[PDB]
Amino acid sequence: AVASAYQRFEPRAYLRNNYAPPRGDLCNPNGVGPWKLRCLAQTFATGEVSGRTLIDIGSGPTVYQLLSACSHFEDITMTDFLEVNRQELGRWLQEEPGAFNWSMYSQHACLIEGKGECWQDKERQLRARVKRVLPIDVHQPQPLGAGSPAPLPADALVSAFCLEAVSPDLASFQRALDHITTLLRPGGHLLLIGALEESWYLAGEARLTVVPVSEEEVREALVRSGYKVRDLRTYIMPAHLQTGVDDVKGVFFAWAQKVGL
Ligand SMILES: Nc1ncnc2c1ncn2[C@@H]1O[C@H](CSCC[C@H](N)C(=O)O)[C@@H](O)[C@H]1O
Ligand SMILES: NS(=O)(=O)c1ccc2c(c1)CNCC2
């Protein structure tokens, strides 16, 4: 019944808590922001993660996780359980009033990538390759998609801070991973980012209870679901980034392959 708590989820508060200074201050190279974008950028740059269709699971109200991705997939589908979030994304996609400002992130993605691209072009490219924002539920064996417009099976998947924040225990976690994995073409690639050893995090009046997982638990989970773990890294949270919006201990990044056998 996490969903019950997620009913009170405030997008603007979530964004403010996790993507605005200090955590949203990309100037310092030792912060999470740089780190996250760096993991994402290096991965796609290897050129091994490519295709036509890609799906972002539990996008929430954020778009940074697709910044380096849009360069490699022409059809991008973003998703999220809450309508509030799908709407918050819409504001940015259609450049509506009050949309969130992702400039710092677009810019840094451009710096790390090194193609001399300007942030305006990357944002316009991402906006262009995002075809639709679909509701989803990782708890359903068929992720809230009876007959979804989304091209299946997607060529790749990306998920940031979703699974561990929507499942109450390690098993819900494991099963949810199984659910989304079905959406992925064999030989496909998964890019997973999430909290390490986190039990709660706020979001306005919403106070989410979550499953504290370790790098090892994540690895085992990926393996159980049939992935070869291509790359798995962890960022330990510095004291200055440890605010009162949660109790994260670190952030992990995983690059996995749906092993076709
Ligand atoms: N059953 C479910 N299946 C999938 N997503 C769910 C869900 N219940 C809640 N969510 C979504 O879980 C997300 C957790 S926060 C996710 C973080 C976001 N991807 C980022 O990178 O910042 C929210 O957008 C929330 O609405
Ligand atoms: N500081 S951060 O940008 O790396 C980040 C992003 C999302 C979430 C957390 C932390 C922790 N709680 C889940 C949401």
UniProtKB/Swiss-Prot annotation:
Reaction(s) this enzyme catalyzes, per UniProt: phenylethanolamine + S-adenosyl-L-methionine = N-methylphenylethanolamine + S-adenosyl-L-homocysteine + H(+); (R)-noradrenaline + S-adenosyl-L-methionine = (R)-adrenaline + S-adenosyl-L-homocysteine + H(+); (R)-normetanephrine + S-adenosyl-L-methionine = (R)-metanephrine + S-adenosyl-L-homocysteine + H(+); (R)-octopamine + S-adenosyl-L-methionine = (R)-synephrine + S-adenosyl-L-homocysteine + H(+)
Gene3D superfamilies documented for this protein: Vaccinia Virus protein VP39
An example Gene Ontology CC term for this record: cytosol
Protein name (Swiss-Prot/TrEMBL): Phenylethanolamine N-methyltransferase
Taxonomy, superkingdom: Eukaryota
Protein family according to the UniProt entry: Belongs to the class I-like SAM-binding methyltransferase superfamily. NNMT/PNMT/TEMT family.
Result, substituting residue 198 to A: Reduced enzyme activity towards phenylethanolamine. Decreases affinity for phenylethanolamine 6-fold. Decreases affinity for S-adenosyl-L-methionine 2-fold
EC number, as in UniProt: 2.1.1.28
Reported regulation of activity: Inhibited by methyl methanethiosulfonate, phenylglyoxal, tetranitromethane and diethyl pyrocarbonate. Inhibited by 4-oxo-1,4-dihydro-quinoline-3,7-dicarboxylic acid, 4-(benzo[d][1,3]dioxol-5-ylamino)-4-oxobutanoic acid and 1,4-diaminonaphthalene-2,6-disulfonic acid.
Residues of the signal peptide: none
Entry function: Catalyzes the transmethylation of nonepinephrine (noradrenaline) to form epinephrine (adrenaline), using S-adenosyl-L-methionine as the methyl donor. Other substrates include phenylethanolamine and octopamine. Also methylates normetanephrine.
Native species: Homo sapiens (Human)
Keywords: Catecholamine biosynthesis, Methyltransferase, Phosphoprotein, S-adenosyl-L-methionine, Transferase
InterPro entries: NNMT/PNMT/TEMT_CS, NNMT_TEMT_trans, SAM-dep_methyltransferase, SAM-dependent_MTases_sf
GO BP: catecholamine biosynthetic process; epinephrine biosynthetic process; methylation
Enzyme class: transferase
GO molecular function, one term: phenylethanolamine N-methyltransferase activity
NCBIfam families assigned to the protein according to its UniProt record, in alphabetical order: GntF_guanitoxin (NF041360)
Binding site for octopamine: 198, 246
